[PDB]
UniProtKB/Swiss-Prot annotation:
Belongs to the glycosyl hydrolase 7 (cellulase C) family. Glycans are attached at T1, S3, S14. The chain holds residues 478 to 513 of 513 of the full protein. It is found in: Secreted. T.reesei produces two different exocellobiohydrolases. They are unique in that they can hydrolyze crystalline cellulose in the absence of endoglucanases. The enzyme consists of two functional domains, a catalytic core joined to a carbohydrate-binding domain (CBM) by a serine-, threonine-, and proline-rich, highly glycosylated linker sequence. N-glycosylated. The catalytic core domain comprises three N-linked glycans which each consist of a single N-acetylglucosamine residue. It comes from the Eukaryota. Residues 1-36 form the CBM1 domain. Exocellobiohydrolases (CBH) that catalyzes the hydrolysis of 1,4-beta-D-glucosidic bonds in cellulose to release the disaccharide cellobiose. The degradation of cellulose involves an interplay between different cellulolytic enzymes. Hydrolysis starts with endoglucanases (EGs), which cut internal beta-1,4-glucosidic bonds in cellulose to reduce the polymerization degree of the substrate and create new chain ends for exocellobiohydrolases (CBHs). The CBHs release the disaccharide cellobiose from the non-reducing end of the cellulose polymer chain. It comes from Hypocrea jecorina (Trichoderma reesei). Disulfide bonds join C8-C25, C19-C35. This is Exoglucanase 1.
């Protein structure tokens, strides 16, 4: 479960793209997305 400030789901990330409750996967860069 991706936590706040962690990379939730950008290109290159094949891991679990689900953020912890309270946060949303905010894609900033195409490869860097962060749970906010
Ligand atoms: C999940 O992890 C983030 C850091 O990656 C923390 O800021 C958050 O409070 C939670 O422990």
């Amino acid at each position: 479960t991706q936590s706040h400030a962690g990379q939730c789901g950008g290109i290159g990330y094949s891991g679990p793209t689900v953020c912890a409750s309270g946060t949303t996967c905010q894609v900033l860069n195409p490869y860097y997305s962060q749970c906010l």
